[PDB]
Amino acid sequence: HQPSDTIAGLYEAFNSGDLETLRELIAPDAVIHLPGTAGDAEHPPGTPRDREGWLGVWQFTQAFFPDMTATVQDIVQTGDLVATRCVARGTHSIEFMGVPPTGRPFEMTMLNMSRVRDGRIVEHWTISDNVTMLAQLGVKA
Amino acid sequence: HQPSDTIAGLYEAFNSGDLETLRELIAPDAVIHLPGTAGDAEHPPGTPRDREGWLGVWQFTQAFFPDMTATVQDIVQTGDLVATRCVARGTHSIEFMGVPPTGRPFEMTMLNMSRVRDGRIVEHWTISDNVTMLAQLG
């Protein structure tokens, strides 16, 4: 099952809130390298997480940016590896970091690389340009 | 050059300080999307830069992390697009945020994507795991 479709499906699933598909497309024991911003006490910056850890982080993000969508811009494959560039678009519609909602939009780059075996993600690296998002939210005209 | 070699050459050039090669491998009018951490007053987070802007930022980084090296771990290509995962290693020789140098090593992930036309980079996206670097520095 072609690895580029696995990754296109993954982001369609994240956008629609479709946990059943996400569990089909990601192995339970997949190694997920989230950036250091996603670290906590139990999981220091640079230590990997499993699928449910990743989905836990995603669930928490959906609470602050419920209209957020990741759109694949470029996609690149060689064998079981797939790399994507996405754009996350959304609004400041929920209060966060102590600032009440402004409605202001944001558009930030995500870069990802994933290893896909048997139609499922088994390793994944991702980083988002979080500082640019914050800059965009503090600058309308 | 096959695009994967252009990108391997690019990081060999950054590691050795080889500005002549970097100018061969990057078009002058290339669009460089650096992460928001690389912004300044003249160039807000998310605004692109040209080759000389990028090299200017790199030169400035070499003042604080003079032994820093990027090593390509994985590389992936399809047409003109190449994507890489690198590891930046260096040592903590300069005080930051009031915490003194330790001499300890640090290791952070970079992800990159580059468009290569006629053996030269014409567009480039990069992001580094900056928070992990700061955690490593203590």
Author numbering:
A (entry chain A): 6 to 146
B (entry chain B): 6 to 143
Sentences copied from the publication:
Indanomycin is an antibiotic from the pyrroloketo­indane family which is known to act as an effective ionophoric agent against Gram-positive bacteria. Each protomer contains a deep hydrophobic pocket which is proposed to constitute the active site of the enzyme.
X-ray diffraction data were collected to 2.7 Å resolution, but attempts to determine the structure by molecular replacement were unsuccessful, presumably owing to the lack of a suitable search model and the large number of molecules in the asymmetric unit as estimated using MATTPROB. The remainder of the structural description will focus on the unlabelled native protein as this should best represent the natural form of the enzyme. Electron-density maps were well defined for all ten protomers in the asymmetric unit, allowing all chains to be modelled, with the exception of some residues at the extreme N- and C-termini (residues in the ranges 1–6 and 143–148). The ten molecules in the asymmetric unit for the wild-type protein form five almost identical dimers. The following discussion of the IdmH structure will therefore focus on the dimer formed by chains A and B unless otherwise stated, as this represents the most well ordered dimer based on an analysis of the overall B factors of the chains. Indanomycin was placed in the wild-type IdmH active sites (chain A and B) using in silico molecular docking.
